[PDB]
Amino acid sequence: DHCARHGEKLLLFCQEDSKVICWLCERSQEHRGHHTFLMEEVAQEYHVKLQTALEMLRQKQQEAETERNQVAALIARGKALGEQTQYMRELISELEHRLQGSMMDLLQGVDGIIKRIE
Amino acid sequence: DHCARHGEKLLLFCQEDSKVICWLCERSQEHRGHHTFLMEEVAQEYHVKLQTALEMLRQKQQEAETERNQVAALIARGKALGEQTQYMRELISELEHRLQGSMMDLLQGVDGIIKRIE
Amino acid sequence: DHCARHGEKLLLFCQEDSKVICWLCERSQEHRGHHTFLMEEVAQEYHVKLQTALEMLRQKQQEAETERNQVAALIARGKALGEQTQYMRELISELEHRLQGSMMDLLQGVDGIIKRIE
Ligand SMILES: [Zn+2]
Ligand SMILES: [Zn+2]
Ligand SMILES: [Zn+2]
Ligand SMILES: [Zn+2]
Ligand SMILES: [Zn+2]
Ligand SMILES: [Zn+2]
């Protein structure tokens, strides 16, 4: 891909901004001093973490459905378990989208995703 | 633009040499250790200084014309004031040319321009 | 030339790996922290050292052939002198190959060559 501001290849990844950028972006005062990595290397790095969180979330979801079934203030526990199961469902959806997308789609905003997991 | 020595894009600016260069030029022993910036950032920086110097030079020119008019060894002061008015006349033209030109045309040799102002 | 891993130009030279690489290779964890130079400058630098070592090795070889001829445990000295003359023959051949080859072929493994000279 190519940068909107500069038109150069998007091969670097800024951690603080959690945003893909080119070298010229790295040298500007906007991203000056930040820590920047190679897009491919960080892509391999985060892909594993989001996959792991995907398996963990799937297990937790199966357990949540089992618990919700067995429950059938038990009603309150059922409701809260339902809302939680929904939130997890959406999270899993986003993780699958990122894992099947391009490296840029995966990295852009990964900080927010990992914050959401925790 | 493209580099004569290397053929790469001219996107960096070396302060010590006050010359626009590419990354390969930055990494050579010729410009090794110098401080280099992004052409756009230093372009915005110097544009303001040459604009300010433009206003200042215009004021000094108006005042010079007023003084020369009122003078009309006062004659010697008239002649010298005339020569000065000529030099400034050229300087203002150069400042407008640079300010209305591209970033490269503005930065190339700006050191000599600012040296001329002072 | 172009990089196998990344497809970018091979314009840099890693001293530790004594290997020509592109910028992306420089920023990977593989070559992170290493000392990297411009390929052309180090090529011009090493060309002179291998040329000097070439002349020196040629002189030493002529002297070695003269000594081996004059020898005709002197026999043991003849044998060892012969083996040495062979090793030098191969070294000189490699030096000529590198000096007439491309910058990459010259630099790739130059550390091993200079170690072989000594
Ligand atoms: Zn950019
Ligand atoms: Zn940044
Ligand atoms: Zn250059
Ligand atoms: Zn310089
Ligand atoms: Zn590479
Ligand atoms: Zn290396």
Numbering used by the authors:
A (entry chain B), B (entry chain D), C (entry chain A): 95 to 166, 179 to 224
What's in the article?
TRIM5α is a restriction factor that intercepts the incoming capsids of diverse retroviruses, including HIV-1, and inhibits viral replication. Like all TRIM proteins, TRIM5α consists of an N-terminal tripartite or RBCC motif (RING, B-box 2, and coiled-coil domains), followed by a C-terminal domain. Higher-order assembly of TRIM5α requires the B-box 2 domain, which is thought to mediate three-fold symmetric interactions that connect coiled-coil mediated TRIM5α dimers into a hexagonal net. We therefore engineered artificial constructs – which we call miniTRIMs – that retain the integrated B-box/coiled-coil fold of the full-length dimer but are more amenable to biochemical and structural analyses.
A P212121 crystal contained two trimers in the asymmetric unit (3.26 Å resolution, R/Rfree = 0.26/0.30), a C2 form contained one dimer (2.1 Å, R/Rfree = 0.18/0.22), and a P1 form contained two dimers (2.3 Å, R/Rfree = 0.22/0.26). The Bcc miniTRIM trimer is organized as a triskelion: three B-box 2 domains make a central three-fold symmetric vertex from which the coiled-coil domains emanate as spokes. As expected, the trimerization interactions are principally mediated by the B-box domain, burying 578 Å2 of the available surface area from each subunit. The B-box packs against the N-terminal end of the coiled-coil helix through a hydrophobic interface (asterisks), suggesting that trimer formation requires the presence of the coiled-coil. The Trp117 indoles in the trimer form a channel that would be expected to have a highly negatively charged hole at the center, which is likely to be partially stabilized by the positively charged Arg121 sidechains. Comparison of the trimer and dimer bonding interactions revealed that the two oligomers are distinguished primarily by intermolecular packing between the Trp117, Leu118, and Leu132 sidechains in the hydrophobic layer. In particular, Leu118 and Leu132, which are located at the outer edges of the binding surface, are in van der Waals contact in the trimer, but more separated in the dimer. In context of the trimer, the three coiled-coils do not contact each other and can therefore move independently. Nevertheless, it seems clear that the B-box trimer is what facilitates hexagonal lattice assembly, at least in vitro.
